[PDB]
């Protein structure tokens, strides 16, 4: 499932259905590292003020 993406580029239309999905744990690591790289500062991000 690719690997080196840190620009919030996660392809969701290329998995597979009968072969190995022994990457769902690895997907979680890939998802987590993308989130950490984009915003490496998260303690209480209520600062949206949607209005």
């Amino acid at each position: 499932e690719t690997n080196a993406v840190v620009i919030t580029d996660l392809n969701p239309l290329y998995p597979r259905d009968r072969d190995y999905i022994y990457e769902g744990a690895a997907q979680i690591r890939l998802i987590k590292q993308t989130l950490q790289n984009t915003f490496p500062n998260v303690t209480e991000p209520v600062d949206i003020d949607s209005d």
Partner: protein, 53 residues
């Protein structure tokens, strides 16, 4: 920058900063302390109290 504005939580009328915005570079828009200097030049040097007044 993000963390400080979080404690604000009241920015609804755009900026509404509690400071005085003590920085600016140029333009007849936002006014620095040079407005007073600009005013006296216009009032004295060229508009009201001209030379030989």
């Amino acid at each position: 920058t993000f963390k400080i504005m979080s404690e604000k939580l009241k920015f609804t009328g755009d900026a509404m900063d509690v400071g005085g915005l003590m920085i600016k570079n140029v333009t007849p828009g936002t006014g620095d302390k040079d407005v007073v200097t600009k005013g006296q030049m216009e009032a004295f040097m060229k508009n009201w109290m001209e030379n030989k007044l």
